[PDB]
Amino acid sequence: LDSLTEQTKMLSTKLSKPVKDIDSLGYVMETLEQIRKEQAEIDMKFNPVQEMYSLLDNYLPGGITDKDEMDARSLLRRNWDILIQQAEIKGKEYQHKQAIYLKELKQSIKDFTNQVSIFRRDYEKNGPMVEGISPAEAMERLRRFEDEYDVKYQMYKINARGENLFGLQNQKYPELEKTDAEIKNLNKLYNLYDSVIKNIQQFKEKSWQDVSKDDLAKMEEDAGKYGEQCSRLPKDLKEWQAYRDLKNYIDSLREQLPLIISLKKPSIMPRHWEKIKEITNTKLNYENP
């Protein structure tokens, strides 16, 4: 009885949990109705209990422990009676006020069309459109756009639920697909850019003692790892400013690979440090050789 009333009270709770399903239903009722089909089925794996408890309460009516039994068993039929009553009453009253729901849908679609209009109008002069430099800040605006059409897409899905409820032609929207495709290529590229540069930065701070760049140069090994990152470099989808930025940097990474393999040996003595500071014309090694 505990297990079975727990299932059925979950079902009644879903009938009672949200305010939406209390007022505006959907496909979900079908699944409830499926379980209501099953309700025959569920009671077929309950009927072991009705007769057995009939035998129990024949000569032991109880009154002490019956509390939970009274709660659970009665709760089952509580559901059943409301299932009848509500199902009739709702069905009649919703049949009365159909036109108002259709009008609500009409206003919903009317607003959503213009929302998509202003949406599509936002793109051409904002964000991923190829206008400006925008050095590596683009991910923030791209992610706000991510949440934007995501929200629009959930709105579209609830509209689809309503339309198929009333059996109309499903309004079909072409622009949202264009959004999704363009950004899909964009966001895969930019995520790769973030991964490469953040890994590159993960390494930018180990010391001579920490960073081993001599003959078993662990960093030259990180350079080799970058050799494989370079092995995922090529892609002919399109040329960007960010793309060539990453290309120039990773070239620099390769440059580093054979650069310092022999520049970390005991070969370099503070006079060689001196020569690096002067001939490079760098004050990096003039402050610290």
Added chain:
Amino acid sequence: MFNFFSSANINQNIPKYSVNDFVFRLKKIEKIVVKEGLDGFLLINGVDSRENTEYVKLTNWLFLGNSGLEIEENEYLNQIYSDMIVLIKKGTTHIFIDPEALNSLQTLIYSIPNVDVFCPTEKQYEDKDEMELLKMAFFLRVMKPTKKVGILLGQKDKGKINSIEKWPLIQSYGLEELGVGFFSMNHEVVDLTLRLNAVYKNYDKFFVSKLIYVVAKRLTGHFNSAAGQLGDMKMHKRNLATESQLTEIFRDTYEIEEISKWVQIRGVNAALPKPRVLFGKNTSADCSKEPSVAPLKDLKYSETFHSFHATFETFDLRTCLRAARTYFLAKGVKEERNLITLNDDEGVPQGYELNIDENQQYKDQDFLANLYLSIIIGFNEVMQLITKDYKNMTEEFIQDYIFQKVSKVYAGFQIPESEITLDKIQIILKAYNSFGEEVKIDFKDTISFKLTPYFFMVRIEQKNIKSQILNNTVLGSLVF
């Protein structure tokens, strides 16, 4: 409409796009090619052709299976089908395709008798410059034995042959290092847009299945559940049935079809009545009316008598399927039982019988009902005659037939010559193909009537009915 469309399951039962529908369309295209020239017709997708659009129409119709306004309504071609070359010739067919597009279309393309399909491994897939070279090599290999080709212009082209030359693939053909020169110079071409667009608007078995299975169910459910509001309302509130409310659902669904840009661009009815619900004298509309907001109690032929007939009419915009009926609003029994409480302080029920009142109204009501029945009997016999001979389709013959039938049933009561004139009855018969209205040429297209090239609508309407219980009283109008 809730508990009906919960059970009908319109969306589940769409006809899948079967092979036998695909072969027919392909063979139609080649037959066009035979008439236009010799070698073939070429299909090159968007990116390489600077985003042409008429190929969007063709890839929709040939593969996706859309038709009618659907072909125009879709505006986005999936990226899976983004890059493809197709060439149709009387001998064979040649297709260059990607693996995923191949996966979706495997059954269809392999179904054709002679197919040449190229699709490369994943290893070739990763090297895209490789793919570019493979594309150009394939194009040269396929193209060589040709002189006369068909091509389809685009909206971006704006009807310029030199814009075909502007396209990147043809420019690559015209590259010096290759040395073959410009494609147009080597091979003659011509625009085929008019023929293909002419083809798109005809019918096929696939969309006949859709016409019978999905849209008809939707329309019937709409009509039935729209009229059912009268069945739903209480008895004492039944007099306040404003026509605006009863015609609200029709107007509302009509607007949902109206929002699309394409339907508005494509056209609208040519002064044909819009969907509506009318009662009594209002049913005699002057070719365009508006529904009154007045209640039934405020409408009446005389202060004592009341209206007893109503008319409903609707059509979905997308295909202009029209259905219109007339219904009755009274019990129309000869005599009825009126119950009277006696002494009024207790009240004893005594049944006074044989109320003359409804007999009076019953004379007129029974007349009108018999007329409605007579109209329908006219129609079914008409339809047997139309089947027996195509030439009888002309509206004039149907007109004469209904006239001579209707006169007989009610002839005995009143004088015929004053009562009836052929001008008081009208018929309309129209011919729709995919939202467009054609002409009726039955002799000329008798060869083309072996198939169904279009579908038909017939409407019949009688006006200015005269009573027999009052003086110079017009009862209204009948429609079907």
